[PDB]
C-alpha cells in the first residue's frame, strides 16, 4: 500500500553534533518504515561494513528494534568497530559482540569536526580496570589507579584522569581525521516486529 | 600492579599528550619557517617553551621508574629515551651559563663579519660572500686573506668560549654517568640488552678506525690526483711530496671537495649529465618534479603521498612580500601530517634534493605506527642515508632516460662515468677523513687526552697525518681553528656524516642485489623493483624500536659497519686513479714543504 512515516535516520546521520565515543549515543528506532537504500546511495559514507546480514536484503528483512549508536573516533580506530577486534576503543570505549547482527557506517567529517585551534569536545577513555562488555557505556570520570597507593581523587603520580581528548585539526592525516560512526544493530523480539522496509505494488 | 604495567600506562598517557603538544610546536615552527613574521616568532617560542617544559616535567615523572626491573625492550627503550636529563642535571646557574655560552656561540657564528682592512664602510658576511670567495676564486693570496682573517677573528673571539664549553659539557656528561661528552655523543650508537646485537659506546671508535684504514688507500690516490690538478692550478706553491695547502680545498674548512670539479675534471671535453635544459624546455614545474619523485617511490613499492602533503607543503618560493626559510627541510609534524619546506628552482640539483627530502618523508611515514618516542631513525646515520640512496638512484642516466629528461640516444661511455664518479668522490670520499679527524679531535679533547695548551698543535698534526692538509702558517692557542665550522660551534654531533656515508652504500648494495642489477654499482636503479622496496621498508617500518644493528641486518645481512660497499662503488674510479698516479707520488709527508 501507499507508504509514509519514514524512520528518523535524518536525526541520526545528519545531526549537527555527535557524542563522544565514551558517552556514545544510543537511539532506538521503532514503529516506522526503515529505508536503508538512502544510506547505501550516499557516496561520502565511504565505509559500509555490514556483518551478519546482507546489505541488499536489509529492505526485506523486518526487525523488532533498530539501535543506532552514534559517536566520533579517529581514522585509524574505525577498524576497531568490528566483532573480535581490540584496542583502546574496543576494550575501553565501545565494544561490539562477536555474534553481531547489524552494520557499521563510518564517514570522514574533517570539514565539520575539526577546528584550526583544535577540537577538544571529543573524548575517549584511555584507561579502564577491565575491558568493556558488549554494548556497555562507561561515563565515569573516576581517577584511574595504575599503582598501589590510593588516588584519593587527585591525579598525581600513577593516578590519571581516564578520559583523553581527540584534538582534531583540519591538517591531520587520514588516520587522525575525525570519522563519524553510526552502528545499526538489528534485534528481533517476541513482540510484533514493526521496523520493516516498504513493500512494492 | 607491577612496575612494568605502571610504565606502560605512564607511556600511554605520555604518548597522547606528547603527540598533541609536539603537533602544536611543529605547526608553530612551520608557520615561522614559511612566514617569517614576529607573531609567528613568538608563537614558535611559546610552543617550544610549552614543549620543553612538558618534557621536563614528564622526564621528572619518568625517572621514578627504575629500568633494571623492566624486561620488555620497547618499554625500556622508551623510558631510556624519556629519562635522559640533558642539561637539567647541573645546577641552575651552570645550566644557565651553558645556555648563555651556546647562544653566544650561535650569535658569533651567525653574525660573524670579517672584511678587508682600510675599507670599513661595509663588510662581508660568511654565508653570502665568504662561501662564494672560497668556492669560486682562483687567487692564492685572496683565499689566504679570507681564510686567515676569518679564522683569526673567529678563533680569538671563540677560544675562551670553547674553553668553558668543553668543561661544562664534560661536567654534564659525567653527571649523566658518561665518561666524557664524546661518550655522551657515542651513546646514540649504544645497544644494550639484546643478545648478539649488542653495541658498546667504546667500540665505535675502533670501528670507525677499522673502516678508515680501508678508506685510506682510495683517499690517498684521490688526494694525489687532486694535488696534481692543483699543481696545474697553482704552479709553485704546492709541493709534490707535501700536503695540500688548507685554503685551496674549495670550502672554508675543507669539508667538501666538490667545488674542485672545474679544476680537477678528468675529461673536460665530455659533457655532463645536467638535465636542467630539458626541464626548462619541457616546462617542468616544481609540482610535477615532486610528482615524478612520487612516481619513483610508487615504482619501488612505497606508499604514495598523502593528500595533506600536497595541500600543505609549500614547494615553491611564495614571493617577495612573504619571507620564508629557503633551506630544504622535510617536516614530520605528527598526527599523520607530513610536509616539505622547499623553495624549488627548476634544476637537476633541486630534483635530486626533492628525491632526498621525499626519502626523508617516506622514512618518517613508515614508522608512524611506532610509539612517539621511538619515531626516529635507529641511529643518526639512517635517516640521511635513506634519502641519499634515493638521490643516488635518481641521478643515474638510466633513470633520467626513463622519465624523459635524458635522450634515448645519449651515449654513456666510460669517460663520463669516470668524471661522474670523480664528482661523487669529491663530494663523498673527500669528506670522510675530515669528518673522522674532526670527531676524533673532539673525542680526545672531551676525553682529556689532548692537553689544554696543545690543541692547535695536535689538531694541525692530525690534519697533516689523517686528512693530508697542511696549514698555511702556524697557529698558537690564541686561535680556535676547529670552531670556525657550523657543527662544532653549535653543539652538533659530527660522526653522523661518516656513518651516513657508509650506510648509504651498504643500503645501495643491498637494494641493488635485491633488484637484480647486473652491472657496476654506480649505474644501478631501484626503480620498478617491488622486492627492493619491501626489503627497505622492513627497516623503515621499525623506526627506533629495534637496535640499529638489527635494522642493518634486516637490510644488508650484516650487523656492523662495512666499508666494502663504498670501495665497490668507487672501483672503476679507483682503477683509473691507480692508472694515472704512476708518475705522481701517492701519499703525503707531514713536513711543511708546500708552505
Ligand atoms: C542528509 O543530507 C544529505 C544531503 O544530500 C541527504 O542526501 C540525505 O538524505 C540526508 N539524510 C541522511 C539520513 O543521510
Ligand atoms: C604570512 O604572514 C602575514 C602576516 O600578516 C599574513 O598576512 C599572511 O596571510 C601570511 N601568509 C599565509 C600564507 O598565511
Ligand atoms: C612490549 O610491550 C608492547 C606494548 O607496549 C607489546 O606489544 C610487546 O609485545 C611487548 N613485548 C614483550 C617482549 O613483552
Ligand atoms: C637525572 O637527574 C636527577 C637529578 O640529579 C637524578 O636523580 C636522576 O637519577 C638522573 N637520571 C639519570 C638517568 O641519570
Ligand atoms: C595513492 O595511491 C592510491 C592507490 O594506489 C590512490 O587511491 C590514491 O588516490 C593515491 N593518492 C595520491 C595522492 O596520489
Ligand atoms: C674506455 O674504454 C675504451 C675501450 O676499451 C678504452 O680504450 C679507454 O681507454 C677507456 N677509457 C677510460 C677512461 O677508461
Ligand atoms: C617503470 O614503470 C613505468 C610504468 O610501467 C614505466 O613507464 C617506466 O619506464 C618503468 N621504469 C623503467 C626504468 O623501465
* Three cell numbers, residue B547: 637496535
Contact in structure between A124 and A88 (CB atoms under 8 Å): yes
Among B255, B252, B224, which Cα is nearest to B427's?
Answer: B255
The reported resolution of this PDB entry, expressed in Å, is: 2.7
Put simply, whether A67 touches B (Cβ < 8 Å) is no
Q: Name the strand (E) or helix (H) holding B150.
A: helix B140-175
**Which residues have C-beta within 8 Å of that of residue B380, sequence separation ≥ 6?**
B188, B493, B496, B499, B500
**Which residues have C-beta within 8 Å of that of residue B38, sequence separation ≥ 6?**
none
Contact in structure between B504 and B522 (CB atoms under 8 Å): no
Contact in structure between B241 and B588 (CB atoms under 8 Å): yes
DSSP three-state, residue B247: helix
Contact in structure between B351 and B290 (CB atoms under 8 Å): no
Cα dihedral sign, B401-B402-B408-B412: positive
Query: How many C-beta neighbours within 10 Å does residue B564 have?
Result: 14
Can you point out the beta strands (E) in B193-308?
244-245
Contact in structure between A194 and A31 (CB atoms under 8 Å): yes
Least Cα separation, residue A53 to chain B (angstroms): 33
A50 forms beta bridges with A103
Q: In angstroms, rounded to a whole number, what is the distance separating the alpha carbons of residues B442 and B461?
A: 14
Contact in structure between B394 and B508 (CB atoms under 8 Å): no
DSSP line for B513-555: HHTT--S-GGG---TT-HHHHHHHHHHHTTTTSS-HHHHHHHH
Query: B20 and A167: CB-CB below 8 Å?
Result: yes
**Which residues have C-beta within 8 Å of that of residue B441, sequence separation ≥ 6?**
B450, B458, B459, B462, B482
Closest ligand 4 atom to B84 CA: 13
Contact in structure between A114 and A12 (CB atoms under 8 Å): no
Q: In angstroms, rounded to a whole number, what is the distance separating the alpha carbons of residues B301 and B295?
A: 10
Contact in structure between B87 and B172 (CB atoms under 8 Å): yes
Instruction: State the residue for C-alpha cell 613508515.
Output: B366
Q: In angstroms, rounded to a whole number, what is the distance separating the alpha carbons of residues B65 and B58?
A: 12
DSSP line for B331-342: EEEETTEEEEE-
Annotated binding-site members of B for substrate: 255, 327-328, 497
Radius of gyration, CA atoms only, chain B: 25
Instruction: State the residue for C-alpha cell 622496496.
Output: B533
Contact in structure between B507 and B386 (CB atoms under 8 Å): yes
Number of H helices, E strands in chain B: 23, 4
Contact in structure between B149 and B114 (CB atoms under 8 Å): yes
Among B391, B386, B359, B395, which Cα is nearest to B503's?
Answer: B386
Q: In angstroms, rounded to a whole number, what is the distance separating the alpha carbons of residues B399 and B255?
A: 29
Name chain B contacts of A158, Cβ cutoff 8 Å: 6, 9-10
Contact in structure between B227 and B430 (CB atoms under 8 Å): no
Among B563, B475, B572, which Cα is nearest to B520's?
Answer: B572
Number of H helices, E strands in chain A: 4, 9
DSSP three-state, residue A49: strand
* Three cell numbers, residue B251: 670550502
Exposure on the CB side of residue B263, measured as CA atoms within 13 A: 22
Among B233, B229, B213, B239, which Cα is nearest to B589's?
Answer: B239
Q: Which residues 76-115 on chain A approach chain B with CB closer than 8 angstroms?
A: none
- Shortest CA distance from B309: residue in chain A: A173
DSSP three-state, residue A13: helix
What Å distances lie between residue B461 and B438, B467, B468, B473, B488, CA to CA? 12, 10, 9, 13, 19
Instruction: Give start and end residues of each alpha helix (H) in A41-142.
Output: 88, 110-113
Active site residues of B: 357, 487
Q: By what method was this entry solved?
A: cryo-EM
A72 forms beta bridges with A20, A180
DSSP three-state, residue A41: coil
Q: What phi and psi, each to the nearest 5 degrees, are found at residue B276?
A: -65, -40
Among B88, B76, B104, which Cα is nearest to B160's?
Answer: B104
- Per-residue b/e over B396-417, b at no fewer than 16 CB within 10 Å? bbebbebbebbeeeeeeeeebb
Q: In angstroms, rounded to a whole number, what is the distance separating the alpha carbons of residues A133 and B502?
A: 54
DSSP three-state, residue A63: strand
- Domain spans, chain B: 3-84, 92-175, 282-393+496-566
SS (H, E, C) B431-491: HHHHHHHHHHHHHHHHHCCCCHHHHHHHHHHHHHHHHCEECCCCCCCCCCCHHHCHHHHCC
Closest ligand 7 atom to B398 CA: 13
Contact in structure between A198 and A58 (CB atoms under 8 Å): no
Amino acid at each position: 500500500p501507499n507508504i509514509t512515516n519514514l524512520c528518523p535516520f535524518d536525526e541520526v546521520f545528519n545531526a549537527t553534533r555527535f557524542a563522544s565515543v565514551y558517552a556514545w549515543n544510543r537511539k532506538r528506532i521503532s514503529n516506522c518504515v526503515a529505508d536503508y537504500s538512502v544510506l547505501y546511495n550516499l557516496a561520502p559514507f565511504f565505509t559500509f561494513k555490514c556483518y551478519g546480514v546482507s546489505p541488499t536484503k536489509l529492505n526485506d528483512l523486518c526487525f523488532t528494534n533498530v539501535y543506532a549508536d552514534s559517536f566520533v573516533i579517529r581514522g585509524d580506530e574505525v577498524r576497531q568497530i568490528a566483532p573480535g577486534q581490540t584496542g583502546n576503543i574496543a576494550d575501553y570505549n565501545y565494544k561490539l559482540p562477536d555474534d553481531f547482527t547489524g552494520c557499521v557506517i563510518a564517514w570522514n567529517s574533517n570539514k565539520l569536526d575539526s577546528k584550526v585551534s583544535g577540537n577538544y569536545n571529543y573524548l575517549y577513555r584511555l584507561f579502564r580496570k577491565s575491558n568493556l562488555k558488549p554494548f556497555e557505556r562507561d561515563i565515569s570520570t573516576e581517577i584511574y589507579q595504575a599503582g598501589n597507593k590510593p588516588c584519593n581523587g587527585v591525579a598525581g603520580f600513577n593516578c590519571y584522569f581516564p578520559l583523553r581528548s581527540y584534538s582534531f585539526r583540519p591538517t591531520y592525516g587520514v588516520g587522525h581525521q575525525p570519522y563519524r560512526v553510526v552502528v545499526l544493530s538489528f534485534e528481533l523480539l517476541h513482540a510484533p516486529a514493526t521496523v520493516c522496509g516498504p513493500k512494492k505494488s | 600492579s607491577t612496575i612494568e604495567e605502571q610504565a606502560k600506562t605512564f607511556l600511554d598517557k605520555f604518548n597522547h599528550e606528547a603527540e598533541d603538544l609536539f603537533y602544536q610546536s611543529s605547526l608553530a615552527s612551520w608557520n615561522y619557517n614559511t612566514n617569517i613574521t614576529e607573531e609567528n616568532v613568538q608563537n614558535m617560542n611559546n610552543a617550544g617553551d610549552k614543549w620543553s617544559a612538558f618534557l621536563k616535567e614528564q622526564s621528572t615523572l619518568a625517572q621514578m621508574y627504575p629500568l633494571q626491573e623492566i624486561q620488555n625492550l620497547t618499554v625500556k627503550l622508551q623510558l631510556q629515551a624519556l629519562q635522559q636529563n640533558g642539561s637539567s642535571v647541573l645546577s641552575e646557574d651552570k645550566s644557565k651559563r651553558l645556555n648563555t655560552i651556546l647562544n653566544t656561540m650561535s650569535t658569533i657564528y651567525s653574525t660573524g663579519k670579517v672584511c678587508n682592512p682600510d675599507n670599513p664602510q661595509e663588510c662581508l658576511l660568511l654565508e653570502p660572500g665568504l662561501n662564494e670567495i672560497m668556492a669560486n676564486s682562483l687567487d692564492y693570496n685572496e683565499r689566504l686573506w679570507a681564510w686567515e682573517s676569518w679564522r683569526s677573528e673567529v678563533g680569538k673571539q671563540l677560544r675562551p668560549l670553547y674553553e668553558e664549553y668543553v668543561v661544562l659539557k664534560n661536567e654534564m656528561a659525567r653527571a649523566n654517568h658518561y665518561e666524557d661528552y664524546g661518550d655522551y655523543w657515542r651513546g646514540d650508537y649504544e645497544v644494550n640488552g639484546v643478545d648478539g646485537y649488542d653495541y658498546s659506546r667504546g667500540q665505535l671508535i675502533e670501528d670507525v678506525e677499522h673502516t678508515f684504514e680501508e678508506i685510506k688507500p682510495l683517499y690517498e690516490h684521490l688526494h694525489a690526483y687532486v694535488r696534481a690538478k692543483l699543481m696545474n692550478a697553482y704552479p709553485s706553491y704546492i709541493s709534490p711530496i707535501g700536503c695540500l695547502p688548507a685554503h685551496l680545498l674549495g670550502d672554508m674548512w675543507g669539508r667538501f671537495w666538490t667545488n674542485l670539479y672545474s679544476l680537477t675534471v678528468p675529461f673536460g671535453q665530455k659533457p655532463n649529465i645536467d638535465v636542467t635544459d630539458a626541464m626548462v624546455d619541457q616546462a617542468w614545474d616544481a609540482q610535477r618534479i615532486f610528482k615524478e619523485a612520487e612516481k619513483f617511490f610508487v615504482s619501488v613499492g612505497l606508499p604514495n603521498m598523502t593528500q595533506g602533503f600536497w595541500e600543505n607543503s609549500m614547494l615553491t618560493d611564495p614571493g617577495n612580500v612573504q619571507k620564508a626559510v629557503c633551506h630544504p627541510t622535510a617536516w614530520d609534524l605528527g598526527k599523520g601530517d607530513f610536509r616539505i619546506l622547499m623553495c624549488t628552482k627548476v634544476t637537476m640539483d633541486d630534483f635530486l634534493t626533492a628525491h632526498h627530502e621525499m626519502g626523508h618523508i617516506q622514512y618518517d611515514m613508515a614508522y608512524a605506527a611506532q610509539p612517539f618516542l621511538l619515531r626516529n631513525g635507529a641511529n643518526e646515520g639512517f635517516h640521511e642515508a635513506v634519502g641519499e640512496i634515493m638521490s643516488l638512484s635518481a641521478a643515474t642516466p638510466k633513470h633520467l632516460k626513463s622519465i624523459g629528461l635524458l635522450s634515448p640516444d645519449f651515449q654513456e661511455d666510460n669517460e663520463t662515468e669516470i668524471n661522474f664518479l670523480l664528482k661523487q668522490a669529491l663530494t663523498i670520499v673527500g669528506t670522510l677523513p675530515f669528518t673522522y679527524m674532526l670527531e676524533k679531535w673532539r673525542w680526545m679533547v672531551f676525553k682529556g687526552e689532548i692537553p689544554k695548551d696543545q690543541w692547535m698543535k695536535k689538531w694541525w698534526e692530525m690534519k697533516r697525518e689523517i686528512v693530508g692538509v697542511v696549514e698555511p702558517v702556524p697557529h698558537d692557542e690564541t686561535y680556535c681553528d676547529p670552531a670556525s665550522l657550523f657543527h662544532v660551534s653549535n653543539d652538533y654531533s659530527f660522526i653522523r656524516y661518516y656513518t651516513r656515508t657508509l650506510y648509504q652504500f651498504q643500503f645501495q648494495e643491498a637494494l641493488c642485489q635485491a633488484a637484480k642489477h647486473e652491472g657496476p654499482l654506480h649505474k644501478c636503479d631501484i626503480s620498478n623493483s617491488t622486492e627492493a622496496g619491501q626489503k627497505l621498508f622492513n627497516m623503515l617500518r621499525l623506526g627506533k624500536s629495534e637496535p640499529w644493528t638489527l635494522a642493518l641486518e634486516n637490510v644488508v645481512g650484516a650487523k656492523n659497519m662495512n666499508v666494502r660497499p663504498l670501495l665497490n662503488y668507487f672501483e672503476p674510479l679507483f682503477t683509473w686513479l691507480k692508472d694515472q698516479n704512476k708518475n705522481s707520488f701517492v701519499g703525503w709527508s707531514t713536513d711543511w714543504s708546500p708552505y
